[PDB]
UniProtKB/Swiss-Prot annotation:
Parent sequence residues shown: 452 to 513 of 1528
Protein name: Rho GTPase-activating protein 7
Domain SAM, first and last residues per copy: 15-76
Consequence recorded when altering L39G: Abolishes interaction with EF1A1
Domain note: The SAM domain mediates interaction with EF1A1, and functions as an autoinhibitory regulator of RhoGAP Activity. The polybasic cluster is required for activation and mediates binding to phosphatidylinositol-4,5-bisphosphate (PI(4,5)P(2)) containing membranes.
Length: 76
């Protein structure tokens, strides 16, 4: 399957593995598990409402991984 750049094809897979390591190191090993289950396509406006305890900065940082996961979840 040679066609795309020999790094971007893996950048999309490290965007899942680094989300596992990031979500786990940050405080949320469950969000990684939810994507590693079957790539779950949630709305950030749902998890933002449930984690409204945290700052907008914590939600934007969490949203960086969750949006990346929720993105590959709608895009296979």
């Amino acid at each position: 399957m040679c066609r795309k750049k020999p790094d971007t094809m893996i950048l999309t897979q490290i965007e899942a593995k680094e989300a596992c390591d990031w979500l786990r190191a940050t405080g949320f090993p469950q969000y990684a598990q939810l994507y590693e289950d079957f790539l779950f396509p949630i709305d950030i406006s749902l998890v933002k409402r449930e984690h409204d305890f945290l700052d907008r900065d914590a939600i934007e940082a969490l949203c960086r991984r969750l949006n990346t996961l929720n993105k590959c979840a709608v895009m296979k």
